[model samples]
Target: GSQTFYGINYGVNENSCPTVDSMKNDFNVLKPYTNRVRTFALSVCNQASLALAATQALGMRIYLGMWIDRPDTFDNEMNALKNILANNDVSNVDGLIVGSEVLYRGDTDPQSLANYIKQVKELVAPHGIKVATADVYYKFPEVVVKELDFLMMNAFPYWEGVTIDNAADTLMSHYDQVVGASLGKPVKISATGWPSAGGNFQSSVASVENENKYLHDVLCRVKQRNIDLLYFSAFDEPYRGGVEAHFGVLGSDRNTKPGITIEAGC
Candidate 1:
C-alpha cells in the first residue's frame, strides 16, 4: 500500500573505492525516503555492516544478496554467508535475496540452487526472515518456489533487445507469463528500471531522456495497478564500468538526472 517506492545501491567494491564520507552522504540523501538498499553479501565485504547500521537507524530495510559467481566457493561462501545473517543487525532487514541473475544465465541449474535455498530457508525460518532469489523472469521452479516466501523476478525490456517503445508491453507480457505460471502465490517485481546512460538504441538500448520517460510510464502504470516494484539503483557505480554501472538515474557527480528530481514523481 505504499505510494511512492524508492531504493538504491550503497557501496563501491574494495579496490576501487570512494571515501566513507562520500558513501555516507549519498546514502544520507536517500535515508528520508529509501525503503531498501541492495548489495552483494561480499561486494563491500564488511562495509555492508556499516550500510546496514545506518539504514536501520533511518528506519529503512535491506535486501542482502548472497553472491555465488564462483561455483567452486559454494561451501566456504555459504559458511561466510551464514555468519553475515547470524551477526548482523537485521531487525530492519526486509529479507534475503539469495542470488541475482545467476541461475537464469545458466551459471547454475535449478536443482543445484534448490539445495542452497532449502538449507538457507531452514536456517533463517527460526529468525522470521523471508527468503527468495532473483533472476531474469524466472518461471519459479516448483521446488524453489515452495522454499521461498516470496516470488521475485527481474523484467528488463531493454535486455531482451526489443524496441524502446514496446518496453512497457514487453514487461507486462512477461509479468503475465510468470504470474500465470506461478500457481496462485503472491509475487513481486524485484528489479525493473532503465539505464539513463550508455548504449545506443541498437545495442544495449539506453538513452538519457527515454530512460526517465520509460520509468515514468512504467511507474504510472504500476502505481495504477498497485504492483510491487523495486527500482534498480541508488547511485551511479563507476566500478561497474564495463557493463552495469550506466544504469544509474543519477550521474557520477551525484547530480540527479534532468527529469529525476527527488520530488518529481510526486
Candidate 2:
C-alpha cells in the first residue's frame, strides 16, 4: 500500500496569490499522498472557495481554517466562511478550524474562543461537519478543549533547538503532553515540520538532509502510534523570510524540493 497522510496544511501567498488553476495543479500533485488538506483562513482572496473546490474535484478533503487574530479580520473571516459553506457542497469538507494558535498569540482568551467555536458549531451542525481550533501545544485551555469537537495542536521540535536525530523525540514529548491534557478527545498535530533550508535554531540545523531524516523519524512514529497529523505546509512562502519561510515540501517554482519527499505512515 502507498503511504498517505491524514492531513497536510496548504496555503497560498496573501500578497501575490497564486492562480486557481495553479493551485489546482498543486492539489493534483498532493492528491497521491494526501486527500486531506488544511487551510489557515477564509477571507484571504477566495482561499476558502478555491481550496474547497480544488480538493473536491481531486478526490480530496479539506479542514477549513478561520483566522481569529483581530476583531475586523475575525468578522471578515466569519462572513466569508458562512458564505462559502452556504454556497458550496460540503461533502468533501472534514471540519472547521476556527482559529489557529489564537490563544498562544493572546489574540483571544479561552472563553471567547469557545464562544466562537459554539457559534460555528451551530452554523455547521446541519452539514454534520466537525469543529475545532489549533493552538501551540502549551496554550490549549481545558475549557476550549472541551468546547472543540476534536483536539488540534501545533508543536515543533526545531523551535526548541533539538538536533535532527532527536526531532521526533522532542515532538513526541510535546505530543504526549498534549495527550495528557487532552481530556480523552481525539488529538491531532495541526502543524509540525523541519525546515528544508535556512539557518539553525541552536542545535537544530535546517537543511535537506535533516528535513529528510526528521520526516522519516517523525512519520514512522506517527504510523506506529496511530497519530493524526497535518504537516506544517505545502509550499515555501517567499513572502516570509528566514527559517520560518522554508518549511514547504514544494519550492518557489512548485517543484518538490530536494530531500523532501512527501509520504506518510512510513
Candidate 3:
C-alpha cells in the first residue's frame, strides 16, 4: 500500500526522547498536517510500540523500520520488529523498511540485505504490509531491487553538496534517477530535508533562512507533482551530532520554525 505524500520521520534515541504519552501529544499536534510517520528502530528505547500507539491513536499510517547494522544485531532487530508487529494493529502499519542506509554504510551486503527483505516480506505480506529498505538513492542494486515491493530512497541535497538555491532541482534529479532504476516498482522518497542550523557539507550550508527556503521550494514541487515523499524528521534530535540536531520543522521546544508551516501543499 502506498503512503501519503506528506509524512515525517520520528526519531527516538535517548532517555531524552519523548515518552509514549508525550509522543501521542506530539502526534495530535501533527495529526492535522501529516497523514503518515516513519520510525527507525523497534527496540531502541521501545520506539516501535510507542510509535505505533501514537500514530494509531491519531489514525496515521506508519512505515516501520528495522535498524540493521552489525551482523550480530541482525537477528535481534528482526525479531524485535516481528514481535512488535504481532502485538500491534496491522492496519496502520503500511510498510516494513528492512534497514536504513545499511548498504551505503557497508554494514550489510546487497545479497544479505535482499535476504532480510525477503524474510520480512513473507512474514508481513499476509497482513498486506509491503516490505522495503531505505538507502541513499544511488546505492540500490538490481538484486535488492528485485526483492523489494517498492523503493524507499533517501535523497539529501545537503549531503550531495548542492547549494540551497539548487537543492530542489537536485533532489528531483536524484528522484528521477531512482525512478529509472526501479523499473516499474513504486518509489517513495523515504527521507529528505535541510537542517535549520549546523555545519555545512561543502556548498550546502545549514541556516534557518536556507532551511525555510528549501522546504518551501521542495515541498511545493513535491505537492504539485503528487510525489510520495517523507520529510527527514518531525523534531530535532540532539543525540545525533551537528546538522542532524536541527532538521526538525518543530524545534526541541515543540514549536514550529519561523518560516515553516505544514500547509496542504507545504
Candidate 4:
C-alpha cells in the first residue's frame, strides 16, 4: 500500500512567511511532482486546517505532524491536533505524526512519547489515520516502536557524516536497519535530504552539485525499490539558518534549485 511514494515536508515559521492562499500557490507548483506533502505543526497561522484545505483541493495526501518540545506544550499541541482532526475535512490526511525528533533531542523520554502516540492513535483510530513519531533510525527504542502503527524514520546520511558519493548506500543501510527493527510494521522514510550549501559535517561537504546528485541518486533507488520516502522539504526555510536554509529543492524564492529536477515517477 506504500507505493504511491514521493512526498515532501512543508513548513512556515515566524520570519517572512506567506499567507495560506500564497502557500497554496506554492503547493500548486509542487503538486505536479509529488502526491503527498508533510507539515510539522498545526498552529502556524492556522496551518493545520489551511494545509488540509489546500492539499485536499490539490488532490494530494498529507502527513500531519505535531510539535512537542516541552511538557507544558504537550497538552496544547495534542489538543490542537485533536480539534483539527475532529473539525476539519481530513480526507487528505495520510496519518498523524506525534513529534519529530523529540526523543532524539532528549526533550521527552520513550515512555512519555509512547503515551502520546497511544493517545493520538486512540483519538484518530476511527478516522483510520495511522499514528507515529519521527526520529533518527537508530534512536528508536523497542518500547516506542511497539507503540506505533508504523515506523517514521528520519535517515540523513549527511548528518551522520557520510559524503554525497556514498549517501544513497548509507541511507539504504539505515532504511534496512529500521525495517528489521520495525518487526513487520510499515516503515516510512519520513525525512531525508541534502543541503545545497552549508558547513561540512565532517567529510560531508554541502554543495549545490552534491545536493542535486544526491536527490537524483536516492530518489532513483527509492523508485526502483518501490519504497516510501518524503523528501526533507519543498522550500528552503531561511529562518532555520545555516544548512537547513538550503535543504529545499525549491529555494525560499520559490524557484527550483539549479540542476535539481525531481522526475515525475519518483
Write the residue-wise lDDT of candidate 2 on 143-221 in tens digits.
8888788888788888888888878988888888888888998888889988977789899898988887777777889
The reply for model 4, stretches above 4 Å from the true place, is 1-5, 15-17, 264-266
In angstroms, the error of model 2 at 15 is: 0.8
- Please give the distance, in angstroms, between residue 209's alpha carbon in candidate 1 and its true position after superposition: 1.2
| Candidate 3: stretches off by over 4 Å | 1-5, 15-17, 264-266
What are the lDDT figures for the candidates, one per model? 0.69, 0.81, 0.81, 0.82
Q: Compute each candidate's TM-score over C-alphas.
A: 0.86, 0.94, 0.92, 0.93
Error of 3 at 225 (Å): 2.6
lDDT for model 4, please. Answer: 0.82
Over the stretch 1-266, how does candidate 4's per-residue lDDT look in tens digits?
Answer: 22233788887885555566887898887876777888888765677888888877777788898888978678888778778866898777788888888877899788888887888888888987888888887888888988888888888889889978899999988888888789799988889889988779999999888887888888788877778889888889888889889998887888877777665324
Best prediction by lDDT? 4
Instruction: List where candidate 1 sits over 4 angstroms from the true fold.
Output: 1-3, 9-11, 17-22, 201-205, 261-266
Judge candidate 2 at residue 214 and give its lDDT. Answer: 77
Candidate 1, residues 1-266: lDDT per residue as tens digits?
Answer: 22355455554567765554655676666665556677666444455566676666656677776777667656655776677676776677677778777767777778888888888889877788888888766556777677777777788877777777778778878877777656777677778777776765464467677677676677666666667677776667787774377677567777776766443232
Residue 84 displacement (Å), model 2: 1.5
Per-model clash counts, in order, read 2, 0, 0, 0
Question: Residue 169 error for model 3, in Å?
Answer: 0.4
lDDT of 3: 0.81
Better of 3 and 4 by lDDT: 4
